[PDB]
């Protein structure tokens, strides 16, 4: 049966640890894929870990130069949550160097972008069967969420970006039914920059928190209903969400130009005028991670918060993060549960190796007692292959 | 429920990438079978990758001399599409150095040919249970499709060849029900040569595009109905389909003797008087791959085409190719979807190794935007074992 | 359907061997997790082996320093009984350095304790979904059974400990329904010490046999009904159950202070005034294992027994042991079958390696002919990595 | 539904190849169990390969001294037919150095014998749950079929042996229902020797062809009905079935004392007064294998045959062989199909290695065209570990 998506988000006071795979530690001897850009998505029965492979195993010579973002060898694959991405336990999804996946209640939807940087094609699959296609319309690295898409009342929604990563680009919202695109709208967003959106369903509508790689150290957001009537803006909080970023001063409801160039994929959960910000602890590199509750952060511009929860220590490597949700028809709850994952990147450019990969931790939002701690990657680099 | 097979082929303007396994790259460290002659076939539930193993793993000493075509150690096995052929994730099918497989809607049919070159026996299995047998009738390397068989209204059809590979041989069409041969007809084809046919269902009838190893650089074809009433001929197009071949001149509706000796397994889709030819880019070796749409290529002899789509680059290794189809009762579409796979051969005779193996890419025919690119094997030879 | 848990324990005269995984022997070359604290639990369909990983494989550098009890890399995972804990065949359960699991008849309940030693959090999952949480209330290493919990008429029960391991601590019994804590009671037990309880259902009530790490070489027990009305005491037998321990003299119904400090996790089955004691053969280290039937051992203090069955030889390594049960709705029997497992620890501190791990054997209680023997670990240390 | 077992054996003129695993060749690099005594058994859904592990992998140090027959580390495990016995794809069955397994139509029955040579215990499991037990009654290596048991109308039947292997021993037939022994009869067989019986169902009755290790180069047989009313005798054929054996002279209906000491496990199918003998090609060692049809071999004593089919070449290693059957409710046929497997032993005592193991081939009896050939093991010894 289709996921309704009409209920609100569950009240959350803390984040309980859900999964840890230990990919790089196990990959030291085991047959584990060299991956990056992992994300979690749930069906009514199970939650799966999606990831973009480099078509190579850890501690093997083919992992050479895997800092490279896009190649013909990259494939989207999935394994059960908390397990290592192995050739022996992973399910093939698509050929992709950029990806998105979600379950509507009946079947899996996957989106796999492959091809040249000037003509990339998104291949849409519903239950493993190709159902539609989208070509790059700006001929400049067609790219998508790198996290799960959002589904409401039988439709699934995604955001795609085409154009430069250091200037004004083109941003489109898609409405997809049974793997077929039924509607799409280009966003009227001058001076905005949307990339790698973390989108979640809330009260029959979708909220995406994205990455401004152009000139924003705070995060851009986009909200829309099923007809794709959207709103745009930035998170106003003085507690900035991207990386790199400045120190916490007064925030802006437009793009914070200071330390605005570059970025990292992230997420945030809106609760009225308040926001749950997940961010790196460091302001200059991808190190550490923390959940922060700013009761006025979504619309207000000050740098105040009432809750901080440690996830990864200041001196430990982190990386990508993203939102996922668990629906009522999975949990039995009457609200939509917010969860998140964190990618822990190891290797290049920061470490003296020939390779780049990442493992994953995940947390779910509860309304009971929790604790801050550091759950780092734990691998001892360099490897035999280095 | 049985596959009907009464509908036409879906209109196709381009080919979207469906799967890539990265077998040789992963096999560098992982436990991956040394294979050749892979093919894809689909049930109403899933698509599987079939392959002929050499009974040995990559980067192991037992892969020595695996350029050899036929041995007692070769077995037909299958794994899910896009996954690596591993001993830990593959299903055993038959003991075979030549194979064919297809799903009638209810159960899998596999055909496995093993035995001596002068008395080979095809073992037919329906749902894993031996249901029939065929002995070599010319005592000269009984061989079959190396791709999937075609099924229409509860029957499945195959083509087998017995005799020389550089002269006139014997060619038989088989009709199989629930694993048992109910009818067979020898083809009256003097001056023709049929080997390794790629067969597909279309409007309650079967079209096979095969390999003329004798004296044909263009491809032979055979069409038949359920009663095995057949027609024979060659693809008339001036864009020649086999490898090795000449340059593109005026074609013939008989065998093109020029560069006619030897060959490679291939496929083609008939659309009225038009043909979708898949072929190597090189004319002298198994390198590159491209899809070409000749609107008049099936019956006309000129060398004109209106669409060319790149699949594998001119300098990159390719190999075998074959057709597969997805039926309406799998896709939900009202037509039969044409797809294809490409084997990418690495090692002997062209490379300085002790072994020979191949990985696989696959594409499905869509009527929306697509792109040409190169999706090569990607392995760095020689291996530690060499 | 829910497990009733109203029937008695089956009469047992001997213990038949149920499973042996050979983890360390296979882990010498294979990809097997470095584990400790394994336990078995059964659903109405299957029995599974639960275990706490160190997030590393055997014979790999990441197994360095795995004598360490608690880390952020430890995860609770399960595989089918008798199989090796491998990344390729194991199911992820929780992030935990202390664990408990049980099936109520409908779904799995897992309890995973992770976090700092002064703020640890137990994460409760029902069918893989977080359903509740418990924080450390003494801020001193919140710890649980390391064996399966007990379930009766739709509820599941566990025991947790918080405080010192060489003095008076705090002990709580929990009643859990569908993953949610519905009732909890702190035990009024001055001069008692409860740790790592082996709990089993018997006649709609629960009996736990635990570990007194403080000052007891005999084992403490706690019995309770569904409303958590409990009784406390020690096993009176002169045949002492813990390790280290003294020689067999007259026992006490209170804690036997002699050789009382430290300990090991164990189990015992009450049959009226009689007890089935499972214990190490050695009195100073974790070596050997034996089942002993003392017809008066539960309430009487003498050192007499009528049955002794050998399990592991005196010179062979053992370790943890625990109870598990098989219910009527699994076996078809009209009573609850008692079974047990034994962890066989190899490596540090007793062996010259960089690592510590354990394999597992298991036995079930039958009322027919059996035999004593030694089923040791069988691995030849040190390993290549040492 | 229960297997009826009332129908006759299918008429067989030849043997088509069913499976080949290539265990030792793949085990050279892959993680494959060191095994011996493999056998095949089928349920109404699938056929499985059962095998006795040594609790160690090939090309690992723990495979040292695996020529040893009985240890505490040996376990009975099963994997799907034609697949390699791997820790990642195998199901655990029992702890055993002697085994038997069969499916009654509803659930699997396994028999696992472990323990000391003077007190061994057979542990009976039905659907993975211990249901009964048998102790050694002669205190001299209690041993069983090493092949599948036979099932008729809801009961399953086995043969066990206790006593010396070079003199008169004790032989018992068991009738088992739902894992419980309901009847057993000791065979009145003075001057006979029964070991490692291959038993099959035929017309509501069971025929076992066994091994005379004492003084018989021809094979002993035992037939019985469901009430265990038995007949005993030897295969009269002048074509002797065991190994070692003499040359083919006139046979005896009693034990052929000439070259009678020692032996190997085998099988034979009775068809009236005729017999399908499977045997090694060599008369002094375990080399080669062949199927021979003697139309008068069961009751007549001459050395004539009308069909010989090659299976393994004279210079290639063989080993154990055994019968298996496929029932009507699996095949859809109205008769019981006879099949067989062959173990191909490699290593000690005949080869310069530290280990001993075996791979497996299997054939099923068809009434259509077949071929003789050699399907050897194919591994190149010694291994890196030697
Ligand atoms: C499609 C693509 O190449 N996306 C890039 C991403 C991107 O370049 C930035 O957002 C700027 O546009 O950068 C990063 C990154 O780690 O910052 C990795 C992503 N790699 C992959 N998704 N494979
Ligand atoms: C049955 C058999 O040996 N088929 C051969 C095939 C064949 O020799 C040619 O078509 C000429 O007859 O050649 C090739 C080839 O790569 O050209 C591989 C096939 N190998 C395997 N299918 N194993
Ligand atoms: C939670 C925790 O650290 N438990 C410890 C346990 C414990 O220290 C003693 O019972 C004393 O309190 O000791 C041992 C032990 O081998 O004795 C291992 C356990 N390790 C793990 N369960 N990981
Ligand atoms: C139970 C047992 O040890 N059975 C032995 C078997 C036996 O010794 C002979 O039949 C003589 O009694 O010999 C052989 C053999 O290869 O000849 C292997 C078997 N090994 C195993 N089944 N593990
Ligand atoms: C969710 O959908 C159901 C079924 O349509 C309906 O009962 C309910 O109103 C929706 N939830 C909310 C919170 O409106
Ligand atoms: C990686 O690639 C670089 C250059 O492409 C080369 O110099 C180096 O040797 C490679 N390293 C390995 C381990 O293959
Ligand atoms: C396919 O078979 C169905 C059922 O027999 C029938 O409705 C239809 O006519 C067939 N399709 C075509 C295109 O004729
Ligand atoms: C492969 O075989 C050839 C001859 O058969 C031999 O000379 C060579 O050493 C072998 N190579 C390996 C790696 O086993
Ligand atoms: C077990 O529960 C069933 C169903 O409620 C009941 O028949 C029975 O009384 C209980 N068993 C015992 C031993 O009381
Ligand atoms: C283990 O760690 C110690 C110190 O932490 C170090 O000296 C040693 O080299 C390590 N051993 C291995 C095999 O990594
Ligand atoms: C097999 O059993 C069925 C059902 O009892 C019966 O029809 C038949 O007589 C039996 N088969 C034979 C060959 O007697
Ligand atoms: C095997 O064992 C023997 C003696 O038990 C020993 O001499 C030899 O070194 C061992 N070999 C290996 C490879 O472990
Ligand atoms: C979509 O589903 C049903 C039927 O189309 C409709 O009643 C429901 O309100 C719609 N979902 C929404 C509005 O989210
Ligand atoms: C075969 O199936 C049915 C019943 O035999 C028949 O009606 C149908 O037309 C046949 N299939 C064809 C002609 O493709
Ligand atoms: C709990 O289950 C049912 C319904 O609540 C009740 O009848 C039964 O007696 C209770 N279980 C017990 C007392 O163990
Ligand atoms: C056993 O099964 C049924 C019911 O007990 C009986 O009718 C049948 O004849 C028996 N099976 C035999 C005789 O093989
Ligand atoms: Ca930015
Ligand atoms: Ca040719
Ligand atoms: Ca103690
Ligand atoms: Ca003999």
UniProtKB/TrEMBL annotation, chains A, B, C, D:
N-glycosylated. It catalyses: Hydrolysis of alpha-(2->3)-, alpha-(2->6)-, alpha-(2->8)- glycosidic linkages of terminal sialic acid residues in oligosaccharides, glycoproteins, glycolipids, colominic acid and synthetic substrates. Glycans are attached at residues 6, 64, 153. Substrate binds at residues 36, 70, 195-196, 211, 286. One of its GO terms (molecular function) is metal ion binding. Ca(2+) binds at residues 212, 216, 242, 260, 262. Its EC number is 3.2.1.18. It is an enzyme of class 3 (hydrolase). Keywords: Calcium, Disulfide bond, Glycoprotein, Glycosidase, Host cell membrane, Host membrane, Hydrolase, Membrane, Metal-binding, Signal-anchor, Transmembrane, Transmembrane helix, Virion. The keyword Magnesium does not apply. Residues 9-386 are annotated as: Head of neuraminidase. Its cofactor is Ca(2+). Intact N-terminus is essential for virion morphogenesis. Possess two apical sorting signals, one in the ectodomain, which is likely to be a glycan, and the other in the transmembrane domain. The transmembrane domain also plays a role in lipid raft association. Homotetramer. Belongs to the glycosyl hydrolase 34 family. This is Neuraminidase. The gene is NA.
């Amino acid at each position: 049966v289709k996921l309704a998506g009409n209920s609100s988000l569950c009240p959350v006071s803390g984040w309980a640890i859900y999964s840890k795979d230990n990919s790089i530690r196990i990959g030291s001897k085991g047959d584990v894929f060299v991956i990056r850009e992992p994300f979690i998505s749930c069906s009514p029965l199970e939650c799966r870990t999606f990831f973009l492979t480099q078509g190579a195993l850890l501690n093997d010579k083919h992992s050479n130069g895997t800092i490279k973002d896009r190649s013909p060898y990259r494939t989207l694959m999935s394994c059960p949550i908390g397990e290592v991405p192995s050739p022996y336990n992973s399910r093939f999804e698509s050929v992709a160097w950029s990806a998105s996946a979600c379950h509507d209640g009946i079947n899996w939807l996957t989106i796999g972008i492959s091809g040249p940087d000037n003509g990339a094609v998104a291949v849409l699959k519903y239950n493993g069967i190709i159902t539609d296609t989208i070509k790059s319309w700006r001929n400049n690295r067609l790219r998508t969420q790198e996290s799960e898409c959002a589904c409401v009342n039988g439709s699934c929604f995604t955001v795609m970006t085409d154009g430069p990563s250091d200037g004004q680009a083109s941003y489109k919202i898609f409405r997809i039914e049974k793997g077929k695109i039924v509607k799409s709208v280009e966003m009227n967003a001058p001076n905005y920059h949307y990339e790698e959106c973390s989108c979640y369903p809330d009260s029959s509508e979708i909220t995406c928190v994205c990455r401004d790689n152009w000139h924003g150290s705070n995060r851009p957001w986009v909200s829309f209903n099923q007809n794709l009537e959207y709103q745009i803006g930035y998170i106003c909080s003085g507690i900035f969400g991207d990386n790199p970023r400045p120190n916490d001063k007064t925030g802006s409801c437009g793009p914070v130009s200071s330390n605005g160039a570059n970025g990292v994929k992230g997420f945030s959960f809106k609760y009225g005028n308040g926001v749950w910000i997940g961010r790196t602890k460091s302001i200059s590199s991808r190190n550490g991670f923390e959940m922060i509750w700013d009761p006025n952060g979504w619309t207000g511009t000050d740098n105040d918060f009432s809750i901080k929860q440690d996830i990864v220590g200041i001196n430990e490597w982190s990386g990508y993060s993203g939102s996922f949700v668990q629906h009522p028809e999975l949990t039995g709850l009457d609200c939509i549960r917010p969860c998140f994952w964190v990618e822990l990147i190891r290797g290049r450019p920061k470490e003296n190796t020939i390779w780049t990969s990442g493992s994953s931790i995940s947390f779910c939002g509860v309304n009971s007692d929790t604790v801050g701690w550091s759950w780092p990657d734990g691998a001892e680099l360099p490897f035999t292959i280095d």
